[PDB]
RNA sequence: AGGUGGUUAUAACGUUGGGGAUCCACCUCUUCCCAUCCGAACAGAGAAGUUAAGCCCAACGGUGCCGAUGGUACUGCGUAGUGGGAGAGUAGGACGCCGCCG
RNA sequence: GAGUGUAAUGGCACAAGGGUGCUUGACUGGGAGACAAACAAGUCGCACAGGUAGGAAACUAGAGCAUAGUGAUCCGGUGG
RNA sequence: GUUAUCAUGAGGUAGAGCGACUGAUUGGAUGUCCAGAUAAACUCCGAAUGCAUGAUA
């Protein structure tokens, strides 16, 4: 909350499972139709065997 | 020999025994014991000799309690040493006792054996003593 | 390593101590100048 | 279970009065409990000789002359350090209103099996019990016909009557 | 605000149904997610304390601080001045967004999770690899709940989506 | 540790030097979530000399002015000036400052 | 044969100087103490070495309070 | 059901129940006064919600606290007398008592 | 049951223990009255005038939680 | 000035105690508990005397 110290780039982005926008720092080089910031990931919790 | 595992101080001022014992004048563990009629310092060597004597009697059936522990350091100067120049060479520990304090407690043996076993122990001690039986004792069940 | 100090600037002087290996810069404190009857800066000599 | 005691009135108090009392082979004594103040009176060494010097316990039926008649139990005996003679007694008044803690003898009444060899050992000689004064046994019998090997009967693992075993539960009342 | 709606709109209306509270203030609510890691190796090589700060900030999104020692133990070369820990205390929505970054992507990237709490209802997690997250020498994770026993804590815990076990 | 043990700790620190006599009575304030109160107290006597509050009377800081002024009129009639202001475990800020400022701006040397 | 002892320092003559009931002039020393064995009450001040002294003339009063804490104060008129 | 004092806990701590007219509180959000790694604390802005918790009331001898009478220890004077009289423990007491303001 | 640079003892919760913001009162002229006391020495403390620091203010500040860390006179040095 | 009486005050000795601290310590059941017990440099307690102040004789 303090001005300054907090690092920037913390902007919303939707992760891909291989879609849910979540405020995260990691800004992968991509875009998508706003909610442009996108990151591609491997099997999420929807595809992990034991987790499902 | 009975002595503290460690002490805070190496020397101690020789105190003063004043009156009758107000603690440890009653039997708690056994049914028979011996109690002092004088005030005196009791040494560890005296206690070990008396305990071996009472344990030698009663064969191997019964339990003996020592109800005093020597925690008072004493010293002695020695021959050819004049007065002054500080305290002398250490000489072990003693336990100060006053009249009424119980020394040896015995249980597990009939009345006559206990009376005789503590008589042998009292004859190794520097103070005259007295036999005590607990007031709830039963002469018709031993 | 704690020596006498004399802060200056009749003249106005204040005597005090300080550790010469801990405080290595000359002392400079505001004190009351009796001659001027107001606070002025006194520096070590 | 019952003892007959009587005692004379006591008026003076202090170092001088008490020393003169025992000069006649008497004992100062007090009685207190529940409603009302205490009672100061005098008993004799002959009178209380069989009340205290005994393996038994009794409910003292006390008749203090000049004051009245009550029921009491032994609470505290004061002994001389050297002579081991009685110098003071206080009796707790007992009524049928609330329980009272007292310790009754416990007797190991045959031994279990062949037994481990002359053991049959009574360890805890007395057990604290709280109950109405007219519910306290004269004795605490136990039957011992099980576990002739290394065993122990605890204080908690026993139920006698409408008593209450306050005698430091999870302890050991017999063994071997 | 990803699991925030899922909790207030959906998860809360079920906790009261089962445990049967007479109100809505008796239901457990995790209040913070504390993260920490021990840097005893930094007692002899302290250049790896700043790097931990930089890594411990890209994950949660909010700056962390060093933790100074508190004891004088020679067996760890420890005197009561050294920085040997880095902690971050996420709270309110900051832990809400962080929680979704973990239940979906952290446990999935594991090479599930133990079921044992402190007894007051605070599940703590020590993961031995820091690359389990996207932005990245493990780090502790503690969810301090408003529950009372493990029963109430577990119901709040499993509703979020924590993989847990059995 | 529970929003009150600290306040009582701060209360006793302030009371270590601030009290009230027949002259210079103590000005005491209590801040609730919705209201605000004031009281003039004579510690030697133990009784309250005057009072004001906003229970029966803008944002919360805008209402502390009226409490800070209504306590002046009550003390103005009774003949009180040069009161001493105690924090009562409250930081000197916000609503509490406006109450103190209004009391000073009136007839009291708070 | 020797002693490693034989040392001592001068005693400081500490303690209560004006007892409860007596009259004090302003400035009078009431208690010399190490620490606040006694605490300053009304009209009583404390020095650098915890010396208790009278700020006003009057009657010396001792008073025990919570946790058996002792206070010294002067009763004026 | 609040604020603020006096009385050295017989006043404290705790346990089990009750309480939402209005109050106290938790509660909601950080644009502003102000604050920490974090509106957790502190501060500001509100009344959408609850008595669940703090808080207050009833009952409880549970932990602590108070505590006789008698006897004893010790002791001033004096050479057994003449005066003072503990500590511990036991009967018991105690779930406060009083002022001001709203 | 910790800490309080340093022995021991006494003290400390409104902390005298731990943090930060600003500061130099580790002030000029002072000593009503006491403690202690062979002397020489030692200790605590004013009232108010001048000018400051912190504070919203009340107020506090003539060094440090206290008690050791020391050396007369003669004779010389330095600044007014 | 002294002594007595009354009023007021501050004590930490004798004694006592040890789940009130520190150190030491006995036996049991088994760090937990039940008993037993110690000290110039231990104290949750605590006299008798003595001491200070005022008044009267
Ligand atoms: Mg000395
Ligand atoms: Mg008496
Ligand atoms: Mg003078
Ligand atoms: Mg003694
Ligand atoms: Mg003793
Ligand atoms: Na000497
Ligand atoms: Na006598
Ligand atoms: Na007593
Ligand atoms: Na002990």
UniProtKB/Swiss-Prot annotation, chain A:
Listed as disulfide-bonded, the cysteine pairs are none
Q: Name one GO biological process term.
A: translation
- Kindly state which keywords UniProt assigns to this record, in alphabetical order: Ribonucleoprotein, Ribosomal protein
Return the GO cellular component terms, semicolon-separated. ribonucleoprotein complex; ribosome
One of the entry's Gene Ontology molecular-function terms is: structural constituent of ribosome
The record's comment on protein family reads:
Belongs to the bacterial ribosomal protein bL31 family. Type B subfamily.
Q: How does it assemble?
A: Part of the 50S ribosomal subunit.
Q: What is this protein called?
A: Large ribosomal subunit protein bL31B
Source gene? rpmE2
Swiss-Prot record, chain B:
Cysteine disulfide links: none
Cross-referenced PROSITE patterns: RIBOSOMAL_L16_2
Name the GO cellular-component terms: cytosolic large ribosomal subunit
Keyword annotations of the record? Ribonucleoprotein, Ribosomal protein, RNA-binding, rRNA-binding, tRNA-binding
Q: Does the keyword RNA-binding apply?
A: yes
Q: Which domain of life is it from?
A: Bacteria
Molecular functions (GO terms): rRNA binding; structural constituent of ribosome; tRNA binding
| An individual GO BP term | translation
Asked whether the keyword Zinc-finger is assigned, the reply is no
Its function? Binds 23S rRNA and is also seen to make contacts with the A and possibly P site tRNAs.
Q: Which family does it belong to?
A: Belongs to the universal ribosomal protein uL16 family.
Subunit relationships: Part of the 50S ribosomal subunit.
Q: Which HAMAP family match?
A: Ribosomal_uL16
Q: By what name is this protein known?
A: Large ribosomal subunit protein uL16
Swiss-Prot record, chain D:
Spell out the protein name for this chain: Large ribosomal subunit protein bL25
GO MF terms here are:
5S rRNA binding; structural constituent of ribosome
Source organism lineage?
Answer: Bacteria, Pseudomonadati, Bacteroidota, Bacteroidia, Bacteroidales
Could you tell me the keywords of this UniProt record?
A: Ribonucleoprotein, Ribosomal protein, RNA-binding, rRNA-binding
InterPro entries reported for this sequence: Rbsml_bL25/Gln-tRNA_synth_N, Ribosomal_bL25/Gln-tRNA_synth, Ribosomal_bL25_b-dom, Ribosomal_bL25_C, Ribosomal_bL25_long, Ribosomal_L25_dom, Ribosomal_uL5_bac-type
Q: Does the keyword Ribosomal protein apply?
A: yes
Q: Which family does it belong to?
A: Belongs to the bacterial ribosomal protein bL25 family. CTC subfamily.
Q: Which HAMAP family match?
A: Ribosomal_bL25_CTC
Q: Name one GO cellular component term.
A: cytosolic large ribosomal subunit
The cross-references to PANTHER family, in alphabetical order and at most eight, read: RIBOSOMAL PROTEIN L25/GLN-TRNA SYNTHETASE, ANTI-CODON-BINDING DOMAIN-CONTAINING PROTEIN, RIBOSOMAL PROTEIN L25_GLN-TRNA SYNTHETASE, ANTI-CODON-BINDING DOMAIN-CONTAINING PROTEIN
Subunit field text: Part of the 50S ribosomal subunit; part of the 5S rRNA/L5/L18/L25 subcomplex. Contacts the 5S rRNA. Binds to the 5S rRNA independently of L5 and L18.
Keyword Ribosomal protein part of the UniProt annotation: yes
Function in brief: This is one of the proteins that binds to the 5S RNA in the ribosome where it forms part of the central protuberance.
Q: Which GO terms describe its biological process?
A: translation
UniProtKB/Swiss-Prot annotation, chain E:
Q: Which GO terms describe its biological process?
A: translation
Any matching Pfam family: Ribosomal_L5_C
**GO molecular function terms attached to this record:** rRNA binding; structural constituent of ribosome; tRNA binding
- SUPFAM superfamilies with a match to the protein in the record: RL5-like
Q: Which InterPro entries match?
A: Ribosomal_uL5 (IPR002132), Ribosomal_uL5_bac-type (IPR020930), Ribosomal_uL5_C (IPR031309), Ribosomal_uL5_dom_sf (IPR022803), Ribosomal_uL5_N (IPR031310)
Q: Which GO terms describe its cellular component?
A: ribonucleoprotein complex; ribosome
Keywords (alphabetical) are: Ribonucleoprotein, Ribosomal protein, RNA-binding, rRNA-binding, tRNA-binding
Q: Which domain of life is it from?
A: Bacteria
Please give the NCBIfam families that the UniProt record associates with this protein: PRK00010.1 (NF000585)
| Stated family | Belongs to the universal ribosomal protein uL5 family.
> What is the annotated role of this protein in its UniProt record?
This is one of the proteins that bind and probably mediate the attachment of the 5S RNA into the large ribosomal subunit, where it forms part of the central protuberance. In the 70S ribosome it contacts protein S13 of the 30S subunit (bridge B1b), connecting the 2 subunits; this bridge is implicated in subunit movement. Contacts the P site tRNA; the 5S rRNA and some of its associated proteins might help stabilize positioning of ribosome-bound tRNAs.
Q: How does this protein assemble? A: Part of the 50S ribosomal subunit; part of the 5S rRNA/L5/L18/L25 subcomplex. Contacts the 5S rRNA and the P site tRNA. Forms a bridge to the 30S subunit in the 70S ribosome.
* Name used for this protein in its record: Large ribosomal subunit protein uL5
The protein's organism comes out as Porphyromonas gingivalis (strain ATCC 33277 / DSM 20709 / CIP 103683 / JCM 12257 / NCTC 11834 / 2561)
């Amino acid at each position: 909350m303090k001005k300054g110290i907090h690092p920037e780039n913390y902007r919303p982005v939707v992760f891909k499972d291989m879609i849910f926008i979540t405020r995260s720092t990691m800004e992968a080089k991509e875009t998508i139709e706003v909610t442009y910031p996108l990151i591609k990931v491997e099997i999420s919790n929807t595809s992990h065997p034991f987790f499902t | 020999m009975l002595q503290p595992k460690k002490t805070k101080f190496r020397r101690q001022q020789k105190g003063r025994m004043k009156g009758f014992a107000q603690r440890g004048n009653q039997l708690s563990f056994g049914s028979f014991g011996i109690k002092s009629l004088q005030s005196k310092w009791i040494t560890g060597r005296q206690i070990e000799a008396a305990r071996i004597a009472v344990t030698r009697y009663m064969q191997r059936q019964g339990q003996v309690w020592v109800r005093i522990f020597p925690d008072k350091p004493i010293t002695k100067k020695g021959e050819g040493v004049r007065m002054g120049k500080g305290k002398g060479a250490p000489e072990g520990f003693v336990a100060p006792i006053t009249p009424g304090r119980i020394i040896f407690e015995v249980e597990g043996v009939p009345y006559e054996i206990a009376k005789e076993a503590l008589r042998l122990a009292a004859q190794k001690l520097p103070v005259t003593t007295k036999f005590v039986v607990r007031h709830d004792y039963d002469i018709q069940n031993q | 390593l704690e020596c006498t100090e004399h802060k200056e600037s009749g003249i106005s002087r204040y005597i005090t101590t300080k550790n010469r290996k801990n405080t290595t810069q000359r002392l400079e404190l505001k004190k009351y100048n009796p001659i001027l009857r107001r606070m002025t800066l006194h520096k070590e000599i | 279970k019952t003892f007959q005691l009587t005692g004379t009135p006591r008026a003076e108090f202090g170092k001088k009065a008490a020393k003169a009392i025992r000069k006649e082979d008497q004992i100062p004594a007090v009685l207190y409990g529940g409603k009302g103040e205490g009672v100061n009176f005098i008993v004799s060494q002959d009178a209380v000789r069989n009340l205290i010097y005994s393996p038994e316990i009794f409910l003292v039926e006390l008749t203090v002359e000049g004051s009245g008649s009550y029921k009491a139990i032994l609470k505290e005996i004061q002994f001389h350090p050297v002579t081991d003679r009685i110098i003071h007694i206080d009796f707790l008044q007992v009524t049928d209103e609330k329980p009272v803690v007292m310790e009754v003898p416990v007797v190991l009444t045959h031994a279990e099996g062949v037994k481990a060899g002359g053991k049959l050992s009574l360890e805890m000689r007395k057990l604290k019990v709280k109950a109405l004064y007219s519910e306290i046994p004269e004795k605490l019998d136990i039957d011992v016909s099980d576990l002739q090997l290394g065993k122990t009967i605890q204080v908690g693992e026993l139920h006698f009557e409408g008593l209450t075993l306050m005698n430091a539960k999870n302890a050991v009342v017999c063994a071997v | 605000a990803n699991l925030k709606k899922d909790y207030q709109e959906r998860i809360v209306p079920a906790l009261m149904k089962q445990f049967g509270y007479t109100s809505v203030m008796q239901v457990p609510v995790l209040k913070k997610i504390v993260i920490n890691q021990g840097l005893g190796m930094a007692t002899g090589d302290k250049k790896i304390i700043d790097v931990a700060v930089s890594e411990l900030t890209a994950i949660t999104g909010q700056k962390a601080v060093p933790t100074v020692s508190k004891k004088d133990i020679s067996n760890f070369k420890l005197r009561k001045k050294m920085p040997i820990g880095v902690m971050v205390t996420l709270r309110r929505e900051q832990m809400y967004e962080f929680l979704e970054r973990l239940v979906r992507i952290a446990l999935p990237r594991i090479r599930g999770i133990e079921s044992k709490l402190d007894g007051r209802g605070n599940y703590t997690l020590g993961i031995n690899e820091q690359i389990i997250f996207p932005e990245i020498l493990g780090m502790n994770i503690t969810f301090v709940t408003s529950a009372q026993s493990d029963e109430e804590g577990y119901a709040l815990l499993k509703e979020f989506g924590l993989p847990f076990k059995n | 540790v529970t929003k009150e043990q600290r306040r009582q700790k701060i209360k006793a620190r302030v009371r270590g030097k601030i009290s009230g006599t027949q002259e210079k009575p103590r000005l005491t304030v209590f801040r609730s979530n919705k209201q605000i109160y004031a009281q003039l107290i004579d510690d030697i006597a133990g009784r309250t000399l005057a009072s004001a509050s906003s229970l029966k009377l803008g944002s919360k800081k805008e209402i502390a002015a009226k409490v800070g002024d209504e306590i002046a009129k009550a003390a103005t009639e009774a003949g009180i000036s040069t009161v001493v202001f105690d924090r009562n475990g409250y930081l000197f800020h916000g609503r509490i400052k406006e109450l103190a400022d209004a009391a000073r701006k009136g007839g009291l040397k708070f | 044969g020797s002693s490693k002892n034989g040392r001592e320092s001068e005693s400081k003559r500490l303690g209560v100087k004006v007892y409860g009931g007596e009259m004090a002039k302003a400035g009078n020393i009431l208690v010399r103490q190490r620490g606040t064995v006694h605490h300053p009450g009304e009209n009583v001040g404390i020095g650098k070495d915890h010396t208790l002294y009278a700020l006003k003339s009057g009657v010396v009063v001792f008073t025990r309070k919570k946790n058996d804490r002792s206070y010294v104060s002067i009763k004026t008129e």
